[PDB]
Amino acid sequence: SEESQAFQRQLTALIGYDVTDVSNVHDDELEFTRRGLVTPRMAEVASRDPKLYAMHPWVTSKPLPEYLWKKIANNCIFIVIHRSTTSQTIKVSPDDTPGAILQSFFTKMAKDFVLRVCGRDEYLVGETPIKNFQWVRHCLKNGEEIHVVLDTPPDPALDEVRKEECDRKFRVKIRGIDIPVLPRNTDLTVFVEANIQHGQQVLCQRRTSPKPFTEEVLWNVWLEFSIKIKDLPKGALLNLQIYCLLYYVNLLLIDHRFLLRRGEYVLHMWQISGFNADKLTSATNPDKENSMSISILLDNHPIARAEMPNQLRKQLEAIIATDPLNPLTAEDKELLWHFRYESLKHPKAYPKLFSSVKWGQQEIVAKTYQLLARREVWDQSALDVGLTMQLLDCNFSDENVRAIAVQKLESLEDDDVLHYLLQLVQAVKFEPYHDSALARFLLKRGLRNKRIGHFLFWFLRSEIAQSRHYQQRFAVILEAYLRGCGTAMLHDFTQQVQVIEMLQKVTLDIKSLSAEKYDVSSQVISQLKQKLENLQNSQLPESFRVPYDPGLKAGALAIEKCKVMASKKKPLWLEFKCADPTALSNETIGIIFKHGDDLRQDMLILQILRIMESIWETESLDLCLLPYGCISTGDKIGMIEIVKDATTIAKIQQSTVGNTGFKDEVLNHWLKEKSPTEEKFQAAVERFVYSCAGYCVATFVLGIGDRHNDNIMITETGNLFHIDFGHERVPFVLTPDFLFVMGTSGKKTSPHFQKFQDICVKAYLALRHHTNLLIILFSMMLMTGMPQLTSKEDIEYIRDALTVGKNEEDAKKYFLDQIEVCRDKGWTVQFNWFLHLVL
Ligand SMILES: O=C1NC(=O)/C(=C/c2ccc3nccnc3c2)S1
């Protein structure tokens, strides 16, 4: 239709990819998926209530942390209901409801309405305690006053959606392979390797005679396998690889309609470079112009009580209580299997139990599917994200195992889906098929909530504009989401995508007009400013929503405050004005555009940091972390949130001494001066101690605590925070300037440094209580976030770091040891840091 085809062009521009393309495809799994996601989209949109969907109340059922009550020791909240002039400050109770609250206002005013926060697209509605709104806790945690404005409920009419209406051994013939360009140094040979895979696990492997690596190499040789056609499990993967490893490609032997792949195929392959999630994609290489290829032929159809002793039961248990990174063995597996009804009564044993299943045999898989049939213990157990996330990684390809995994996620409330959305989304790369429990689950949660949906949009978009391996799949999941969020949501995303395109065009140009040789010369300096105008004209929207912070709505770009950070690279530093007039602060909005870093690795790292707070919180601890917003929007490019009143530590040093040259007291001077009243400098020391320990533990477990001062920042208010995360040693950073702030010197004691270790070990062991969770996220971050890593050696770092095994009491000491190693280096390495880091 003249406009229907027009709408698709819209969704296409938003999505950054053309789902309506069938150029790079060899079947119809995608279309079937769009076809298939239509249902899930429909059930949810219909189900979602406009009354709450249009205001996305953001709340939690978790208990208000123990470190957030001193604020309210009078069981009285100081909400400050605004309006237009009369800002009456009502008093409510930590239990009152946005309804009751509206009462203590109209009850205090005499002779519909909703209370959204001032300067933010956040409403405080819904039958939920005023203490269960993340905002109220945000205000309580920052000493800020809980404000709010009396305004009418948003016309839900806006959340309007456009109208919607054999028992033979497996065989495989390798015809040959081809590549346009040949002339490559060596005159070596090459062979093809066909592997039948299921969950990383190879179930068979066949090769080919080493023929010379010429422009074209035909083999016309059948590759007979041992596995029988009735044993190939759903999810199985024919992994073709070229060795001389330089090229790989995959092809599911069992389609989406439960049929066995049969026919001629010309697969364009991915190039390798010298484990990670890309080697797993069922996608073919889009660039059929200069990429290796392989012709194969497929032609061969539906789909297919005593009690453990005591000593052995003592053996099974020792297996169960082991980290995920600890491999298994022929015996452990046979043990876990033969007693599959025993190990079944233990949820934590599911990952290991399913790793001992011989998927390459119909009979065994058949039994396995019968094991799952009864999930009393699992379905009844408390939700364990660690364990759940484990059944969604690269090791589980059976949809039924993975399926129960999503079954527990179903039990997650928004606030928790926000804490994991990113990894949940990265986990879709492990799914063997496009349409899946996990996708269906992400898609629904997106539609049911505008916050999750906003973040789903960018997380998926991040993958589509950068991942050839997984764009088609993500794009298809995105389009499905876009057709259910609403007309408003669309208007928003559109405005957002436009602003970034241009600001990204500006970003790359400036980087060009500026040589490696540090400059920020008059010229480029005059250029950026000149550039920031050709856009502020009309094209660049008068306003737009902030991708890393959905509430905030940026307006005009304050050219007068925009610049270009030094850095080898040339990140851009932009600032806008809040498009909301009801704001009660002068604070503009600072976003940092940059090119050069894999801004995805950053995202993941900040994601983990928010998961380390959440943990610390449940254990009543607060290490004041500042995981700033960051959204990767393309290959080596994205945006960064700008924390107000923050300075690099290095600059804090060279702000008293010299350049090339470190006064241990430089920091304590900055804090006292950059602070009005002493009552405040006291605070600053407080927030500095907590957040300081915070990045100490966190950065350590992650193995990213050895960084040059230039990547460490602090605020005039006391909060410190690391930055830059895209990839004499040391644990972390506890330099004399910090140590000094706490009040200490070479080997000493203090009311603060004592607090420092006091807060650390407590937060550290707290993390140790989530060893398995941390390991799994960690292990998923490498597989989808970093190049290609050994499925052992690289993940193993997290295992030694978190010191799995050791008794708490020891670890309690282990940390401190690492702490003393600090003094041992004083300014050693920090002074050294100019060279480089490796290994
Ligand atoms: O990877 C990276 N490359 C860069 O240039 C970075 C700079 C940066 C990051 C966060 C900030 N937050 C508040 C203030 N200033 C900031 C500066 S991070």
Short mmCIF file of C-alpha atoms in Angstrom, two decimals, residues 650-663:
data_model
loop_
_atom_site.label_atom_id
_atom_site.label_comp_id
_atom_site.label_asym_id
_atom_site.label_seq_id
_atom_site.Cartn_x
_atom_site.Cartn_y
_atom_site.Cartn_z
CA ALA A 650 45.55 13.25 37.22
CA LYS A 651 44.35 16.79 36.51
CA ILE A 652 43.73 17.08 40.26
CA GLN A 653 47.45 16.47 40.66
CA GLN A 654 48.73 18.63 37.82
CA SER A 655 46.51 21.31 39.39
CA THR A 656 49.16 22.08 42.00
CA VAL A 657 52.42 20.56 40.79
CA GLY A 658 53.62 20.26 37.20
CA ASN A 659 52.89 18.14 34.13
CA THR A 660 55.44 15.44 33.24
CA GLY A 661 55.91 14.87 36.97
CA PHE A 662 52.72 13.63 43.03
CA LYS A 663 51.68 15.39 46.25
#
